[PDB]
Amino acid sequence: SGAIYVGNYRVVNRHLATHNDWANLVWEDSSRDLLVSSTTAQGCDTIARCDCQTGVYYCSSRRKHYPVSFSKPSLIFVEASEYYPARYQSHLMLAVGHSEPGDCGGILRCQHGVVGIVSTGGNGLVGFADVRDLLWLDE
Ligand SMILES: NC(=O)[C@H]1CCCN(C(=O)Cc2cccc3c2CCC3)C1
Numbered sequence: 001s002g003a004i005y006v007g008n009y010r011v012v013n014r015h016l017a018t019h020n021d022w023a024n025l026v027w028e029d030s031s032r033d034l035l036v037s038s039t040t041a042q043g044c045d046t047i048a049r050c051d052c053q054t055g056v057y058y059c060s061s062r063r064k065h066y067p068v069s070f071s072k073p074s075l076i077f078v079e080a081s082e083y084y085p086a087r088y089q090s091h092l093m094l095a096v097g098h099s100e101p102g103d104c105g106g107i108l109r110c111q112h113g114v115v116g117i118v119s120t121g122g123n124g125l126v127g128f129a130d131v132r133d134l135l136w137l138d139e
């Protein structure tokens with residue numbers, strides 16, 4: 001579990017979005033596993049606007065943060081699950097690292113700010129849904 005709070009927006013994994021997220025829907029993209037809802041309070045997270053390929057992510061299944069090198073946002077095949085049929089998920093970045101299903105929503109950060117959130121994993125890999133291209137989150 002986990003979310004990003006920036007301005008009047010809340011960014012969560014689309015498969016974990018609540019009834020309130022869907023009732024206050026701003027934008028969602030099944031292919032990115034992302035959903036943005038509107039909030040009443042002002043969020044304080046800063047979004048990175050860069051092309052960093054190193055950062056640190058939060059791993060709930062270990063209660064630890066880990067440094068990682070990660071790939072650039074790309075189309076990657078994601079195995080079948082209880083939330084989606086087998087498909088290509090876009091704007092996804094992979095890293096070698098520990099991850100378990102309940103790890104979705106853990107934030108990835110670089111020196112510039114929030115890069116993305118955990119969205120896929122397994123076999124000693126971890127995948128992050130990128131948010132750096134969503135320039136509207138800041139206006
Ligand atoms: N984006 C998707 O299609 C996901 C939808 C929810 C289900 N999902 C996974 O649980 C994949 C997975 C396996 C093993 C470790 C981990 C994960 C996610 C977090 C770390 C994939």
Ligand SMILES: [Zn+2]
Pocket residue numbers: 048049050051052110111112113
């Ligand atoms: Zn950066």
